[PDB]
């Protein structure tokens, strides 16, 4: 809250999850999946006691998914469905969530980098015409991550549910020519896990079963460390088989899949994506920077996003980077490798770094009038008010 009583809300609006709260807070006040469901009848499910409205949104639309057809309003960071997104935002600022009068509040929104501009333009238009907010700012995600960590230099590897992006920043100066954006994240990993499980005889073909497979990938799956050793474990031993109880009651068994579904981040060719993994992409991003910044970029690799919470992802990333550095910088001199100093900063609450950075930035800039895009500027200019941020649109 600023000196005018106008609450300063911070809303992350992720492809796979909304994390909303107030400025200066230390934890997101509400974290709920971003999906909108509509009631349907199914010949295999029977419920007759829980009141199901004609439109469930967010948390209740996920816990009650057995009796709904759910769909995400976002995808790859690009809003595919605008009506469902407006419903999700009505629910976010509604009574059974953050309860605010949007006529007298400021909001801090985010957006991935290298995203179509019509998306941000329409989001600002919606925020100024539908909810009629008194102030809107659209910050960069890596900048917010470096705000939350408390740094001014580092290469943010932000891998959310919808999209992975690597953004380096040096001494506070953004290098926008090194921003890389790989389109593999939690959702593609979930789809790959669905494929692998279908190889075992389980069929998850409905809209609700996607959340079941998501909750499986979150509990069981993990990123391997020495993929040859993990394959030897999966092919020779039987210590990787683990059982999971679906909501209906069925018991499925997940084995080698545990380390094959999240491997599609380091070996994209498994899911028919022609490129390089997140480790090789990080190394190429670094080695594309000037010589005088590489040595500091190697020491401040900041992980963020939920999809980097796989057990053993920091260590595997570090091992991959060390191998790449040994082969392609030292050209094979093992003696010098012990001098190479990486530091993959994986904070414990790295699943909400963007929100914490937004909270810090809003707590800093709540009481200014040259930072926020004011509603009057919108009514006067239109979608040109975005030029305040540094993104030039006419």
């Amino acid at each position: 809250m600023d000196s005018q009583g106008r609450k300063v809300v911070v809303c992350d609006n992720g492809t796979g999850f909304v994390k909303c709260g107030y400025a200066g807070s230390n934890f997101p006040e509400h974290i709920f999946p971003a999906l909108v469901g509509r009631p349907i009848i199914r010949s295999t499910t029977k419920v007759g006691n829980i009141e199901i409205k004609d439109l469930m949104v967010g948390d209740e639309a996920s816990e009650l998914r057995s009796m709904l057809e759910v769909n995400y309003p976002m995808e790859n960071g690009i809003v595919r469905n605008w009506d469902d997104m407006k419903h999700l935002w009505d629910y976010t600022f509604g009574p059974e969530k953050l309860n605010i009068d949007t006529r007298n509040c400021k909001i801090l929104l985010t957006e991935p980098p290298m995203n179509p501009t019509k998306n941000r333009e329409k989001i600002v238009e919606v925020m100024f015409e539908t909810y009629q907010f008194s102030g809107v700012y659209v910050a960069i995600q890596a900048v917010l991550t470096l705000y939350a960590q408390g740094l001014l230099t580092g290469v943010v590897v932000d891998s959310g549910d919808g999209v992975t992006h690597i953004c380096p920043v040096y001494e506070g100066f953004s290098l926008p020519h090194l921003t890389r954006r790989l389109d593999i994240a939690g959702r593609d990993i979930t789809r790959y896990l669905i494929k692998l499980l279908l190889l075992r005889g389980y069929a998850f073909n409905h809209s609700a079963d996607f959340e079941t497979v998501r909750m499986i990938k979150e509990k069981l799956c993990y990123v391997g460390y020495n993929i040859e050793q993990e394959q030897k474990l999966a092919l020779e031993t039987t210590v990787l088989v683990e059982s999971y109880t679906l909501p209906d009651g069925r018991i499925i068994k997940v084995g080698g899949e545990r380390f094959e579904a999240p491997e599609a981040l380091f070996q994209p060719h498994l899911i028919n994506v022609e490129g390089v993994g997140v480790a090789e992409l990080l190394f190429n991003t670094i080695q594309a920077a000037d010589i005088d910044t590489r040595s500091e970029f190697y020491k401040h690799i900041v992980l963020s996003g939920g999809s980097t919470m796989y057990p053993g992802l920091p260590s595997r990333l570090e091992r991959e980077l060390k191998q790449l550095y040994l082969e392609r910088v030292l050209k094979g001199d093992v003696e010098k490798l012990s001098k190479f100093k990486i530091r993959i900063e994986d904070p414990p609450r790295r699943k909400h770094m963007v929100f914490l950075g937004g909270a810090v930035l809003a707590d800093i800039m709540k009481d200014k009038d040259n930072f926020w895009m004011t509603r009057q500027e919108y009514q006067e200019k239109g979608v040109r008010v975005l030029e305040k941020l540094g993104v030039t649109v006419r």
Partner: peptide, 7 residues
Amino acid sequence: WXAXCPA
């Protein structure tokens, strides 16, 4: 997206 990829 509009061209390339879905979103």
